[PDB]
């Protein structure tokens, strides 16, 4: 009657979301995989349900007696040999979960999505929940997957009155980055001195604990059918590495490749594929999309939810302090 | 009773075919998906039906009262980040549409397929509808998708009495190339003096209005179960570029890369994959297939349907003009 | 119920299976695909059921009156342009087949899997049936495919009482390598003097007929539910080539690339991908997995089954002769 189910709780975001809910005193049930590793888990007094999103039979048991569902992705950019197969399984998995929660009579669903599902501006002014997005401008399987999944949730919200509120975190950094996420691995390589080169670009960094808190705020004050960007700070990658290096007491990376220098590679790529009669993975048309800065505003969640992200330097600082104490810099 | 249905009408080939059928006085229904840009369409006075091939349930309404179906590929050679997923949708969609059309009692189906579904020769004698082809000779997802789709149409002709005539256009060029098409893009790069190199290739260029006409002609004179190639001119790529440059009044590109110089990249490609335990995208064997000239004959369509295509010059000349009037070039 | 059924008999590994089953006086029936060139079923005394693992309906017929089933994948490491689609087809073709075998009352099933489905050691001690594996450790699609299909067969064994014994060959070398197999290609490139360089790995080479023997020996002495490695010799790739070259009467390749030299290539690949916003196909984590020697122990098949394979030397010798006689060597 009173159970909060969170999925993806072994992940970086999932577990931080779980901790927040716990300190707010929800009764937790955590869906985990048959495989799965309960390491940043045992910390939580929590019911554990075992299940798997691709098979709707194991989900009803887990959603019995559940009032509130937080759907958080199991991983965050987990590399795989089969990316197209993973995108189908993740899109369908989300659909099964959403339909199952609907069927079990869950009252409120908070769906964790991502800025990767959202649109971009070209003039370098930060994008928001209103920026138009089209399938034809999405560039990789990671983003395409987040885009398709988010579109599924919006279809179910409209066609079937799914009581879902959507959250779109930017790129979370912070302590407890166990696998390291890709952004963690970059911060680690850099803090360690072993990152000689990099390709410039723009991203938005957000403390993982702020993402977490923002999920709780969406449950408390968010409106069914709305998306809310959960960003922190719009930062260039060079500036990020400047901060990492200054905090870690090390030399910043020597080599900065401008994105416009990838143009020739794009061109060669188109010529190789043509010459071989295959599809290029990368083209000039590809580069012109990925050139855009990934800059987002969190103003909608600021006004509408009282979301208060701490600055990017705080997230980077904690992530490094944690990496040092936990042996990751060796 | 008497409606003509046309899919892919927003695309380059689809809308030409649509226009041709209107000057012939057919009543048009356009199968369309929900976000489709309505801009290429407006000039037609057509019923629009929103429907999605991947799903049988949506098609029966779009087929009520339809005497004639033109199934034209939604896109032409559109790069995607999920080529295999799109292949599944093209192949399954075409099956669905074809079953739904049997179930709705459609009297004629013109199926738009491509020379990419057909077999190639190695003596540089132009191939035709008769050239043998086997699934294992086909080297990219794009050609494989078209080969498999056509096989399905052939199966349903043979097993379920599907009343389909098949049309196999070569590579269409001309006005109204809005995206543009990858070939229009080569036209553009070349016309403006920024294609410094190209890999020698041979292909077959057809005026996009000849493809559209050929489609109308196949309905009026073609026999159920027959494939007809709708080509124009077989031309080497360097000759196509020398022609483009002369028309645009610039210097031809002067760096022509032989295909055989790709060997060492194909070698390095196999060894790199082996060293990383993955599948190479490109092998020595791929390269032997890519070598073959995409030369084709339209003799069957000229003799059986009256098809009278124009030279490549007209196609390229018309493309450049349009590109000029609508600001893609000077 | 008299007939021994074998799929993939047209394959390199099937062609060896039948041969050995003739030598044993099983009454054989060979499942065989409508296309597939029937070259190795040629003068075998066998029934000729035509079928396709993709749909259950061609199977009910071919299975009827069959006591013993050997399921051998027909394509050994076949490069394709659609590898994830092929993995789906191989997993489901195996599920279908196994379900049809239940129906038909088959007593014993011999499943051909592969060491690719198994775990690997980091220390370079040969791994065995017992070595732990998880999905996330798995490096390429071929491996993933083999892994998933076996995880399927293990499920049917467990929960539906599939009467299957599992066999895991290492890498087959010998006569009748038609495509060839990627390894056969490496033997041709080597035997002809066309291999300047190679990356150093370890491999387990097994005479293709010893794999055949192993299949039969598994039938006659092996427990339901158990796996059996069917290997030969663990050798470094370099020694393999010295071996191929001496037998070919040619100079060995003299460029041996260390595995650790790919590390900057992995790095470059991660950066180009980040810059182009696509998923890297190869990363430092990939490289760490693929560094491991593909080394395996056959002790279990030796003890439970009296498997006694020959040295790798014989395999290479049988294979080169075959190549020479069929006119594929310079
Ligand atoms: Hg997320
Ligand atoms: Hg650094
Ligand atoms: Hg077409
Ligand atoms: Hg040019
Ligand atoms: Hg096998
Ligand atoms: Hg060699």
PDB file of N, CA, C and O in Angstrom, chain C residues 67-101:
ATOM      1  N   UNK C  67      15.624 -40.360 -33.394  1.00  0.00           N
ATOM      2  CA  UNK C  67      15.973 -40.755 -32.040  1.00  0.00           C
ATOM      3  C   UNK C  67      17.099 -39.836 -31.518  1.00  0.00           C
ATOM      4  O   UNK C  67      17.086 -39.392 -30.354  1.00  0.00           O
ATOM      5  N   UNK C  68      18.049 -39.535 -32.404  1.00  0.00           N
ATOM      6  CA  UNK C  68      19.269 -38.843 -32.035  1.00  0.00           C
ATOM      7  C   UNK C  68      19.463 -37.632 -32.940  1.00  0.00           C
ATOM      8  O   UNK C  68      19.438 -37.759 -34.178  1.00  0.00           O
ATOM      9  N   UNK C  69      19.631 -36.468 -32.298  1.00  0.00           N
ATOM     10  CA  UNK C  69      19.871 -35.181 -32.963  1.00  0.00           C
ATOM     11  C   UNK C  69      21.258 -34.550 -32.651  1.00  0.00           C
ATOM     12  O   UNK C  69      21.603 -34.292 -31.476  1.00  0.00           O
ATOM     13  N   UNK C  70      22.029 -34.294 -33.706  1.00  0.00           N
ATOM     14  CA  UNK C  70      23.252 -33.495 -33.615  1.00  0.00           C
ATOM     15  C   UNK C  70      22.958 -32.132 -34.213  1.00  0.00           C
ATOM     16  O   UNK C  70      22.776 -32.030 -35.420  1.00  0.00           O
ATOM     17  N   UNK C  71      22.903 -31.088 -33.385  1.00  0.00           N
ATOM     18  CA  UNK C  71      22.724 -29.718 -33.906  1.00  0.00           C
ATOM     19  C   UNK C  71      24.043 -28.954 -34.077  1.00  0.00           C
ATOM     20  O   UNK C  71      24.611 -28.483 -33.105  1.00  0.00           O
ATOM     21  N   UNK C  72      24.517 -28.854 -35.317  1.00  0.00           N
ATOM     22  CA  UNK C  72      25.740 -28.117 -35.613  1.00  0.00           C
ATOM     23  C   UNK C  72      25.438 -26.839 -36.408  1.00  0.00           C
ATOM     24  O   UNK C  72      24.920 -26.904 -37.514  1.00  0.00           O
ATOM     25  N   UNK C  73      25.746 -25.680 -35.837  1.00  0.00           N
ATOM     26  CA  UNK C  73      25.707 -24.400 -36.577  1.00  0.00           C
ATOM     27  C   UNK C  73      26.307 -24.527 -37.980  1.00  0.00           C
ATOM     28  O   UNK C  73      27.392 -25.088 -38.167  1.00  0.00           O
ATOM     29  N   UNK C  74      25.608 -24.026 -38.985  1.00  0.00           N
ATOM     30  CA  UNK C  74      26.048 -24.266 -40.378  1.00  0.00           C
ATOM     31  C   UNK C  74      27.173 -23.314 -40.795  1.00  0.00           C
ATOM     32  O   UNK C  74      28.093 -23.688 -41.536  1.00  0.00           O
ATOM     33  N   UNK C  75      27.108 -22.086 -40.284  1.00  0.00           N
ATOM     34  CA  UNK C  75      28.152 -21.115 -40.558  1.00  0.00           C
ATOM     35  C   UNK C  75      29.087 -20.936 -39.367  1.00  0.00           C
ATOM     36  O   UNK C  75      28.678 -20.426 -38.315  1.00  0.00           O
ATOM     37  N   UNK C  76      30.326 -21.406 -39.538  1.00  0.00           N
ATOM     38  CA  UNK C  76      31.424 -21.134 -38.607  1.00  0.00           C
ATOM     39  C   UNK C  76      32.059 -19.754 -38.926  1.00  0.00           C
ATOM     40  O   UNK C  76      32.595 -19.552 -40.042  1.00  0.00           O
ATOM     41  N   UNK C  77      31.974 -18.826 -37.955  1.00  0.00           N
ATOM     42  CA  UNK C  77      32.452 -17.413 -38.082  1.00  0.00           C
ATOM     43  C   UNK C  77      32.240 -16.635 -39.418  1.00  0.00           C
ATOM     44  O   UNK C  77      33.068 -15.812 -39.828  1.00  0.00           O
ATOM     45  N   UNK C  78      31.127 -16.886 -40.080  1.00  0.00           N
ATOM     46  CA  UNK C  78      30.795 -16.207 -41.321  1.00  0.00           C
ATOM     47  C   UNK C  78      30.700 -14.671 -41.187  1.00  0.00           C
ATOM     48  O   UNK C  78      29.720 -14.140 -40.653  1.00  0.00           O
ATOM     49  N   UNK C  79      31.689 -13.947 -41.683  1.00  0.00           N
ATOM     50  CA  UNK C  79      31.486 -12.521 -41.842  1.00  0.00           C
ATOM     51  C   UNK C  79      30.158 -12.235 -42.535  1.00  0.00           C
ATOM     52  O   UNK C  79      29.889 -12.801 -43.600  1.00  0.00           O
ATOM     53  N   UNK C  80      29.361 -11.332 -41.938  1.00  0.00           N
ATOM     54  CA  UNK C  80      28.132 -10.824 -42.542  1.00  0.00           C
ATOM     55  C   UNK C  80      28.002  -9.312 -42.371  1.00  0.00           C
ATOM     56  O   UNK C  80      28.570  -8.720 -41.445  1.00  0.00           O
ATOM     57  N   UNK C  81      27.212  -8.663 -43.231  1.00  0.00           N
ATOM     58  CA  UNK C  81      27.109  -7.221 -42.935  1.00  0.00           C
ATOM     59  C   UNK C  81      26.154  -6.882 -41.772  1.00  0.00           C
ATOM     60  O   UNK C  81      26.210  -5.714 -41.261  1.00  0.00           O
ATOM     61  N   UNK C  82      25.340  -7.876 -41.334  1.00  0.00           N
ATOM     62  CA  UNK C  82      24.296  -7.698 -40.305  1.00  0.00           C
ATOM     63  C   UNK C  82      24.499  -8.580 -39.076  1.00  0.00           C
ATOM     64  O   UNK C  82      23.671  -9.422 -38.720  1.00  0.00           O
ATOM     65  N   UNK C  83      25.595  -8.356 -38.360  1.00  0.00           N
ATOM     66  CA  UNK C  83      25.910  -9.339 -37.322  1.00  0.00           C
ATOM     67  C   UNK C  83      24.899  -9.455 -36.178  1.00  0.00           C
ATOM     68  O   UNK C  83      24.766 -10.528 -35.625  1.00  0.00           O
ATOM     69  N   UNK C  84      24.219  -8.387 -35.788  1.00  0.00           N
ATOM     70  CA  UNK C  84      23.270  -8.502 -34.673  1.00  0.00           C
ATOM     71  C   UNK C  84      22.010  -9.214 -35.097  1.00  0.00           C
ATOM     72  O   UNK C  84      21.425  -9.949 -34.324  1.00  0.00           O
ATOM     73  N   UNK C  85      21.590  -8.999 -36.343  1.00  0.00           N
ATOM     74  CA  UNK C  85      20.485  -9.761 -36.907  1.00  0.00           C
ATOM     75  C   UNK C  85      20.828 -11.223 -36.968  1.00  0.00           C
ATOM     76  O   UNK C  85      19.979 -12.055 -36.753  1.00  0.00           O
ATOM     77  N   UNK C  86      22.088 -11.534 -37.222  1.00  0.00           N
ATOM     78  CA  UNK C  86      22.491 -12.952 -37.391  1.00  0.00           C
ATOM     79  C   UNK C  86      22.492 -13.612 -36.023  1.00  0.00           C
ATOM     80  O   UNK C  86      21.994 -14.699 -35.861  1.00  0.00           O
ATOM     81  N   UNK C  87      22.963 -12.907 -35.016  1.00  0.00           N
ATOM     82  CA  UNK C  87      22.895 -13.377 -33.654  1.00  0.00           C
ATOM     83  C   UNK C  87      21.466 -13.662 -33.176  1.00  0.00           C
ATOM     84  O   UNK C  87      21.206 -14.713 -32.570  1.00  0.00           O
ATOM     85  N   UNK C  88      20.535 -12.746 -33.451  1.00  0.00           N
ATOM     86  CA  UNK C  88      19.145 -13.036 -33.199  1.00  0.00           C
ATOM     87  C   UNK C  88      18.702 -14.333 -33.942  1.00  0.00           C
ATOM     88  O   UNK C  88      18.160 -15.252 -33.314  1.00  0.00           O
ATOM     89  N   UNK C  89      18.928 -14.421 -35.258  1.00  0.00           N
ATOM     90  CA  UNK C  89      18.574 -15.652 -35.976  1.00  0.00           C
ATOM     91  C   UNK C  89      19.208 -16.935 -35.377  1.00  0.00           C
ATOM     92  O   UNK C  89      18.519 -17.949 -35.285  1.00  0.00           O
ATOM     93  N   UNK C  90      20.485 -16.897 -34.963  1.00  0.00           N
ATOM     94  CA  UNK C  90      21.128 -18.079 -34.366  1.00  0.00           C
ATOM     95  C   UNK C  90      20.593 -18.449 -33.008  1.00  0.00           C
ATOM     96  O   UNK C  90      20.451 -19.604 -32.724  1.00  0.00           O
ATOM     97  N   UNK C  91      20.290 -17.475 -32.169  1.00  0.00           N
ATOM     98  CA  UNK C  91      19.717 -17.782 -30.866  1.00  0.00           C
ATOM     99  C   UNK C  91      18.339 -18.422 -31.021  1.00  0.00           C
ATOM    100  O   UNK C  91      18.087 -19.507 -30.498  1.00  0.00           O
ATOM    101  N   UNK C  92      17.462 -17.763 -31.768  1.00  0.00           N
ATOM    102  CA  UNK C  92      16.108 -18.251 -31.963  1.00  0.00           C
ATOM    103  C   UNK C  92      16.006 -19.533 -32.793  1.00  0.00           C
ATOM    104  O   UNK C  92      15.234 -20.416 -32.471  1.00  0.00           O
ATOM    105  N   UNK C  93      16.827 -19.672 -33.826  1.00  0.00           N
ATOM    106  CA  UNK C  93      16.908 -20.929 -34.553  1.00  0.00           C
ATOM    107  C   UNK C  93      17.239 -22.109 -33.641  1.00  0.00           C
ATOM    108  O   UNK C  93      16.729 -23.226 -33.846  1.00  0.00           O
ATOM    109  N   UNK C  94      18.079 -21.856 -32.625  1.00  0.00           N
ATOM    110  CA  UNK C  94      18.415 -22.872 -31.632  1.00  0.00           C
ATOM    111  C   UNK C  94      17.273 -23.129 -30.660  1.00  0.00           C
ATOM    112  O   UNK C  94      16.966 -24.291 -30.426  1.00  0.00           O
ATOM    113  N   UNK C  95      16.649 -22.076 -30.117  1.00  0.00           N
ATOM    114  CA  UNK C  95      15.426 -22.233 -29.315  1.00  0.00           C
ATOM    115  C   UNK C  95      14.345 -23.044 -30.083  1.00  0.00           C
ATOM    116  O   UNK C  95      13.842 -24.047 -29.553  1.00  0.00           O
ATOM    117  N   UNK C  96      14.004 -22.632 -31.313  1.00  0.00           N
ATOM    118  CA  UNK C  96      12.992 -23.335 -32.111  1.00  0.00           C
ATOM    119  C   UNK C  96      13.339 -24.826 -32.212  1.00  0.00           C
ATOM    120  O   UNK C  96      12.541 -25.703 -31.822  1.00  0.00           O
ATOM    121  N   UNK C  97      14.536 -25.108 -32.737  1.00  0.00           N
ATOM    122  CA  UNK C  97      14.992 -26.482 -32.915  1.00  0.00           C
ATOM    123  C   UNK C  97      14.828 -27.307 -31.661  1.00  0.00           C
ATOM    124  O   UNK C  97      14.263 -28.382 -31.730  1.00  0.00           O
ATOM    125  N   UNK C  98      15.332 -26.810 -30.531  1.00  0.00           N
ATOM    126  CA  UNK C  98      15.246 -27.486 -29.244  1.00  0.00           C
ATOM    127  C   UNK C  98      13.779 -27.756 -28.838  1.00  0.00           C
ATOM    128  O   UNK C  98      13.453 -28.876 -28.422  1.00  0.00           O
ATOM    129  N   UNK C  99      12.894 -26.769 -29.012  1.00  0.00           N
ATOM    130  CA  UNK C  99      11.459 -26.987 -28.807  1.00  0.00           C
ATOM    131  C   UNK C  99      10.886 -28.055 -29.754  1.00  0.00           C
ATOM    132  O   UNK C  99      10.141 -28.947 -29.324  1.00  0.00           O
ATOM    133  N   UNK C 100      11.245 -28.014 -31.026  1.00  0.00           N
ATOM    134  CA  UNK C 100      10.704 -29.037 -31.927  1.00  0.00           C
ATOM    135  C   UNK C 100      11.175 -30.450 -31.532  1.00  0.00           C
ATOM    136  O   UNK C 100      10.479 -31.441 -31.784  1.00  0.00           O
ATOM    137  N   UNK C 101      12.328 -30.535 -30.872  1.00  0.00           N
ATOM    138  CA  UNK C 101      12.925 -31.821 -30.540  1.00  0.00           C
ATOM    139  C   UNK C 101      12.224 -32.482 -29.367  1.00  0.00           C
ATOM    140  O   UNK C 101      12.173 -33.727 -29.272  1.00  0.00           O
TER     141      UNK C 101
END
